[PDB]
Amino acid sequence: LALHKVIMVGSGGVGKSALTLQFMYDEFVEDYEPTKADSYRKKVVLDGEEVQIDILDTAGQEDYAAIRDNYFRSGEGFLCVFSITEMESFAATADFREQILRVKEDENVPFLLVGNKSDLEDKRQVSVEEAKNRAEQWNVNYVETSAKTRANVDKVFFDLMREIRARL
Ligand SMILES: Nc1nc2c(ncn2[C@@H]2O[C@H](COP(=O)(O)OP(=O)(O)O)[C@@H](O)[C@H]2O)c(=O)[nH]1
Ligand SMILES: *S(=O)(=O)c1ccc(S(=O)(=O)Nc2ncccc2Cl)cc1
Ligand SMILES: [Ca+2]
Numbered sequence: 001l002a003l004h005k006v007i008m009v010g011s012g013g014v015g016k017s018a019l020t021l022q023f024m025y026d027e028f029v030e031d032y033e034p035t036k037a038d039s040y041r042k043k044v045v046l047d048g049e050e051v052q053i054d055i056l057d058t059a060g061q062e063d064y065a066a067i068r069d070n071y072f073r074s075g076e077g078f079l080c081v082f083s084i085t086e087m088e089s090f091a092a093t094a095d096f097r098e099q100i101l102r103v104k105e106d107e108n109v110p111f112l113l114v115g116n117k118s119d120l121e122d123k124r125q126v127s128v129e130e131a132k133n134r135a136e137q138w139n140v141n142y143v144e145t146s147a148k149t150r151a152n153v154d155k156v157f158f159d160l161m162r163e164i165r166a167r168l
């Protein structure tokens with residue numbers, strides 16, 4: 001099977017693990033150890049083709065730059081997550097983008113900008129407009145998700161795999 005290597009990136013508390021666990025296990029998991037990184041593998045039928053998705057749920061603990069870069073080098077696509085309720089997590093996505101680009105050397109690397117916690121509209125700090133503008137500047141798609149309601153969870157994983165399939 002095609003193996004699509006996906007890496008979750010984003011600053012702390014944005015929903016990397018919650019998104020991953022909703023996708024993997026159809027549960028909203030609210031207390032996942034913030035410092036625990038893990039890998040997940042699932043067989044999925046992508047546009048009618050059985051493939052395997054491998055998800056690296058990063059947790060920020062790899063501070064050694066060479067090792068962090070080695071992990072990103074092995075990734076084929078990235079879900080770059082921020083929380084719509086934390087402006088600083090949106091700002092932080094620039095850093096992950098730069099890190100990925102330094103390693104992958106390809107501005108067209110499969111990459112979605114993911115604004116999570118869309119079920120907390122009353123706590124929004126990041127406008128849809130400014131996130132769409134950033135996605136336009138980077139030539140990536142912007143999708144808002146909720147790990148709590150499952151809104152667009154399958155979409156971001158499947159659309160990232162579609163980019164991996166098309167581009168690689
Ligand atoms: N309401 C809401 N809470 C969320 C959502 N995603 C994550 N959370 C909560 O935000 C906290 C941190 O999420 P987590 O996935 O552990 O963040 P990580 O550090 O990026 O892996 C947890 O308490 C989650 O329950 C979401 O879409 N909606
Ligand atoms: S490794 O498999 O021993 C390993 C994987 C992931 C981490 S981390 O998620 O805590 N940190 C990390 N890893 C890759 C890219 C960025 C970041 Cl922050 C640590 C070890
Ligand atoms: Ca986590």
Ligand SMILES: [Cl-]
Pocket residue numbers: 037038039
């Ligand atoms: Cl792992």
